[PDB]
Amino acid sequence: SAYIEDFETKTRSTVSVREGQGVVLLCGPPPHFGELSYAWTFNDSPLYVQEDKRRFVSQDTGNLYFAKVEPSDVGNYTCFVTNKEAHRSVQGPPTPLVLRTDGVMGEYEPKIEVRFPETIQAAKDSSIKLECFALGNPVPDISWKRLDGSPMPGKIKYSKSQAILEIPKFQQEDEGFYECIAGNLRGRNLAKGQLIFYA
């Protein structure tokens, strides 16, 4: 029952962007059945971004996010898609990224490009994963808050420069409103949602 087709497109359009500009590269995985995982390559090497708040790969959307693009980002990207159930992986087409020479992008407030749902039904003892990442210049910082201002239980797991907040072993006291804040010197924006317990 589980499968994934090869990508169909041989080469993607060159991405031209300004130094300082926020960009999202879309994976666009081919037809499939089964849960997908994602990595991106850069010039024929895997991307090591998990301690870099400027670049993020979402295992939910599959996309590669550049909060702001720097000269070092120039090269060829591909999306590498694993279908674990299918025991099969397929690589996407080469995607050239180049800098424009028209000048640099100015500074501007963060814009959240990946977020978590506004309402989430969370089963007892289940694990809830919230993502939040923003484009912006300067590179935004992501933080998290309960609306009731209570400290996070120790079990909560932050990862990828706080782009991801995970809540394991979900209990009733974990329910309520959460928000992620994406902020820089030019301003801040937020995403809020309500986690609702059921058993």
Partner: protein, 264 residues
């Protein structure tokens, strides 16, 4: 509602493909040559109602990604000026240039474009129950075009609008607006205006709009204009999404063809 853009693959010359009205012969915007305008001697004088009252705090502003829109929550009316009946205000939209007050208006007069064009859209509530009804009935709506022109000093009357723009920098942001006086967003002298029959300046480009275009502009300083140049949008391609400045959001001008422009 087909996708459309102000440039590139789904730009103005491609609009007709998905909205066939966009290839019509009574399209907007136009350049108004004053010496060819007919003097509307039959016009009852322009009457405005409610324009002098402070706007409610429920009035709000949105970055749609193509423009910044103001959704009006008060009763504003316009009548006369060769308009067919009494029209009620629904919303405001803006068009602007790139930098340093570069041309951004949709209309022009004797070939002169302006840094910003503000448009107010109207429906006749005696014939339809809402602006949305009038659009879907596809018969007739009203529109005002107001130009802004650079001024050495801040125009304080614009303060709630400028503050509004500061709060809707990104595609889809929304904010409530401080109170403003709609009359004060219109030119000091309403004496000279033009009338002509035309269309929406975005798809579906319906040829249902009775346009009023005011000749005299409303002042705005370079400092205030920067609030417009600080608006962003997003551009979404087959496999890229990017954050971009929202600039030059105006439609190319259209031929008059058989139409004559009238003037007060």
């Amino acid at each position: 509602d087909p996708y459309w853009a102000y440039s590139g693959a789904y730009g103005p010359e491609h609009w007709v493909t998905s909205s066939v009205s966009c290839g019509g012969s009574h399209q907007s915007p136009i350049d108004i040559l004053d010496h060819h305008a007919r003097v509307g001697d039959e016009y009852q004088e322009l009457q405005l109602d409610g324009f002098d009252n402070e706007s409610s705090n429920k009035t709000w502003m949105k970055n749609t990604g193509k423009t910044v829109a103001i959704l009006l929550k008060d009763d504003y009316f316009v009548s006369g000026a060769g308009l067919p009946g009494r029209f009620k205000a629904e919303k405001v939209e803006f068009h602007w240039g790139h930098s340093n007050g570069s041309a951004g208006s949709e209309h022009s007069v004797n070939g002169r474009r302006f840094p910003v064009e503000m448009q107010i859209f109207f429906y006749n509530p005696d014939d339809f129950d809402s602006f949305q009804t009038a659009i879907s009935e596809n018969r007739i709506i009203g529109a005002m075009a107001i130009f802004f022109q650079v001024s050495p000093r801040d125009n304080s009357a614009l303060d709630p609008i400028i503050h509004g723009l500061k709060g809707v920098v990104h595609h889809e942001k929304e904010t409530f607006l401080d109170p403003f006086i709609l009359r004060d967003l219109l030119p000091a002298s309403l004496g000279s205006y033009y009338r002509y029959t035309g269309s929406l300046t975005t798809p579906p480009c319906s040829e249902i709009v009775e346009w009023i275009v005011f000749r005299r502009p409303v002042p705005i300083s370079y400092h205030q204009l920067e609030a417009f140049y600080s608006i962003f949008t997003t551009e979404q391609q087959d496999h890229v999404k990017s954050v971009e400045y929202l600039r030059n959001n105006f439609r190319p001008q259209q031929a008059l063809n058989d139409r004559v422009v009238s003037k007060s």
